Amino acid sequence: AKAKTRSSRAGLQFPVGRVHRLLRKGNYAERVGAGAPVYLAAVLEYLTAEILELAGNAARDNKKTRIIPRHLQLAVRNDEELNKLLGRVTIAQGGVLPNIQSVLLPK
Amino acid sequence: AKAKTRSSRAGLQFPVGRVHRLLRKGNYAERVGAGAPVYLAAVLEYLTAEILELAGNAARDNKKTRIIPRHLQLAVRNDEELNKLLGRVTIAQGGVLPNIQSVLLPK
Amino acid sequence: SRKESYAIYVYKVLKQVHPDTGISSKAMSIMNSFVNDVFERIAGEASRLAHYNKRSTITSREIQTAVRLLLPGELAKHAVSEGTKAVTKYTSA
Amino acid sequence: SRKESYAIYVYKVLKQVHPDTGISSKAMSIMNSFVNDVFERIAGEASRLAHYNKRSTITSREIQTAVRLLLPGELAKHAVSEGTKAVTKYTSA
Amino acid sequence: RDNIQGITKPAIRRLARRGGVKRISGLIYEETRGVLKVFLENVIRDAVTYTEHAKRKTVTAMDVVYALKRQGRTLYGFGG
Amino acid sequence: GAKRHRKVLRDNIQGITKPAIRRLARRGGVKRISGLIYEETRGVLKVFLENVIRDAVTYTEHAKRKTVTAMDVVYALKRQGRTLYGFG
Amino acid sequence: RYRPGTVALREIRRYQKSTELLIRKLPFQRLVREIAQDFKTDLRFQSSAVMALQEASEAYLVALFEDTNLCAIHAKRVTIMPKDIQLARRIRGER
Amino acid sequence: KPHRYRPGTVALREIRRYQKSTELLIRKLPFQRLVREIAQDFKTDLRFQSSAVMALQEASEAYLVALFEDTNLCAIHAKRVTIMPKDIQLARRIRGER
DNA sequence: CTGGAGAATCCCGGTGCCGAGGCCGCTCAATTGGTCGTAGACAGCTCTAGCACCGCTTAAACGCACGTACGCGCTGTCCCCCGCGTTTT
């Protein structure tokens, strides 16, 4: 026939063949389903875009054209869902959300 | 001929063969060295007694002949290194170490 | 030496969301860093459940439930759809 | 059917330290639960350990090393010797 | 239906006593009642997720153990 | 003379300087600082350090090396449940 | 009459060697089933599961109290207040 | 007369600066020798990677940073504005880290 | 309201530059077409346990009085840490 990538077949972008190998060497089970490498791989696309779209948003708010960890730091930590997700993740060079305590504000 | 259990020929108590099976069904890796089940077992008794005699001492101190979940709590929580190991660990019918802060006491 | 990573696919998705935005390399490494993590956390979680029910093969039933276990709230809700849509698309295709 | 645990091996050891001390079932369940964990905690890392050096077979060294990862200080020094002795006793005969 | 209130004040006060509390406010009781729901709801949500995926309609503690660990509170004593 | 021995007082741990400490605190959002903090901080930071470093070194020998790698310490961080992104 | 603050110490002394539950099971049991109703309908509980739940909950609650008590004491008080909980709830990072 | 700012206005300005800044605040040369100091009590004579040497600081800071803001929470609840070690230790104890 | 006044900050246009990003060969991993063993969900049977309720009695809740101790608002007072300009480091 004609070679057609599974990612194309799912209409996805992430390399499922890579992971099905990786799942295969990942020793998570001695056998592995076929749609599982697929099933995860799309959701993989979801979160990256989800973060990437946020990464784009903050990137615009300082009027830059290229995304940086500070943007990444800001985006996820500005997202309560992502921040709850990545609470045990610390970001390299990401910095901190600017936030001064109310009582430190001068009378 | 007459078989001799592996634990005996190491001078131990725990069934190393079970672990060797559990190791092989535990899919931690495709292959298992020969002395590994032994090594892991050796610690197992150690820690196993290491606490038990602590619980025995507490059971002696509460003047009962039988060791209980409360005994399990007290000795573990009274020894610091174990407590570090067992920090995220809850003992059913375990309870609390007795403690009242100094300033709470009357003068 | 050869080193395989995820940059190109991430680069493709970015141009899906922001077709004009650029990207650094360090942040890309972060993305590579991040993907592998969630890659790992799901899979072992996926593994141990199959262990919990004593099964030997990991399918989407396994994958989806842990995604519900792993992703909180709306992401889990929305991503399951993302998973659900692709799977049917693959089986149909 | 037949489901297996560790209480008997516990109880010999009990009689090795306290030859005349009883133990409640609520306690015995606790030990069965407790021992199962401690197995698991190391068991994973050593498995992980093998992956880290791209090696492909678990040995006692990894267990040895893995124990060094968990157990605190002075206790680690004890068991590692005891781990050292038993295999030496095992390997000698 | 107000089963949260079924956790009485002495039920609250006993716990703080075993917690070592000498003197308690009155607003403490409602604060506790709301928060404890959060502990419970989070667990039971995830707990049943096991039960559903395990294809049962009955809640084993073995699920419960699985979850509480998955939260990070490891527990000994109820099967495994 | 007798100047070859006039400065032997490094004793690294103060190398984390008060200006930095306050600079650190200022990024964190503290407005005013006790003076005993500086020393107390030195304790907290160090006691932090080795525990990983121990664990971080703990890897190294097992793979039979002599040069600590970032990836090595990368795993060192994960074990205590504080993960980092960005060094592969 | 005993002066205020004496029985409490005896109460505190009493319970720390006491070990069994401090929450009524049926008020415990009923609340569990109500809450579980909100995710899926028509469940079925093993007493172990509920009991296992109960051990977690009290074990949960007590530790927070100690944290809260520490908060109260640090404010130079002996009377806990909800903000101490919230300050505590914040620092552990589940807030 | 000299134009001195009211004490604290400078600090709030400082607090602003760093919260937009993202760089390290710890000097590299003092930093790594600290680690090179530390390694001796585990194994003699190792050989450090700068990436590793770098990677230390981020954790080093990020850890201590989160410490600070929690410690800042303390004096506020303790109705202060100046931090005490008793605050610092308190959080670590609340962090369960002693 | 309004700032003398200094100082601080943001914004506007130039500069330099090197890294993000397409281009360019190349190989081995991902895709296709074959087999065969087993996993595992699914009907059938089993039966355990889960639920439902009663009824009764007593601990345990519950709804009150009372009294005082502690929470808190407030105010001088004192001293340690905050701004700053050189002088080291």
UniProtKB/Swiss-Prot annotation, chains C, D:
Keyword annotations: Acetylation, Chromosome, DNA-binding, Glycoprotein, Isopeptide bond, Nucleosome core, Nucleus, Phosphoprotein, Ubl conjugation
Location in the cell: Nucleus; Chromosome
Site of covalent link Glycyl lysine isopeptide (Lys-Gly) (interchain with G-Cter in ubiquitin): K89
GO molecular function, a single term: DNA binding
Major localization listed first in the record, in broad terms: nucleus
GO annotation, cellular component aspect: nucleosome; nucleus
Post-translational modifications: Monoubiquitination of Lys-89 by BRE1 gives a specific tag for epigenetic transcriptional activation and is also prerequisite for histone H3 'Lys-4' and 'Lys-79' methylation.
Domain of life: Eukaryota
List of glycosylated residues: S81
Family membership noted in the UniProt record: Belongs to the histone H2B family.
Role description: Core component of nucleosome. Nucleosomes wrap and compact DNA into chromatin, limiting DNA accessibility to the cellular machineries which require DNA as a template. Histones thereby play a central role in transcription regulation, DNA repair, DNA replication and chromosomal stability. DNA accessibility is regulated via a complex set of post-translational modifications of histones, also called histone code, and nucleosome remodeling.
Assembly description: The nucleosome is a histone octamer containing two molecules each of H2A, H2B, H3 and H4 assembled in one H3-H4 heterotetramer and two H2A-H2B heterodimers. The octamer wraps approximately 147 bp of DNA.
Protein name as catalogued: Histone H2B 1.1
UniProtKB/Swiss-Prot annotation, chain F:
Cellular compartment(s): Nucleus; Chromosome
The record's account of how the chain is modified after translation: Demethylation is performed by JMJD6. Monomethylated, dimethylated or trimethylated at Lys-7 (H4K20me1, H4K20me2, H4K20me3). Monomethylation is performed by KMT5A/SET8. Trimethylation is performed by KMT5B and KMT5C and induces gene silencing.
Positions of crosslink type Glycyl lysine isopeptide (Lys-Gly) (interchain with G-Cter in UFM1): K18
N6-methylated lysine carried by residues: K7
Keywords: Acetylation, Chromosome, Citrullination, DNA-binding, Hydroxylation, Isopeptide bond, Methylation, Nucleosome core, Nucleus, Phosphoprotein, Ubl conjugation
Modified residues (Phosphoserine): S34
Modified residues (Phosphotyrosine): Y38, Y75
N6-acetyllysine carried by residues: K3, K18, K46, K66, K78
Modified residues (N6-methyllysine): K7
Residues bearing PTM N6,N6-dimethyllysine: K7
Any single Pfam family the record assigns to this protein: CENP-T_C
Protein origin, superkingdom: Eukaryota
Modified residues (N6,N6,N6-trimethyllysine): K7
Oligomeric form and interacting partners: The nucleosome is a histone octamer containing two molecules each of H2A, H2B, H3 and H4 assembled in one H3-H4 heterotetramer and two H2A-H2B heterodimers. The octamer wraps approximately 147 bp of DNA.
Entry protein name: Histone H4
Source organism: Xenopus laevis (African clawed frog)
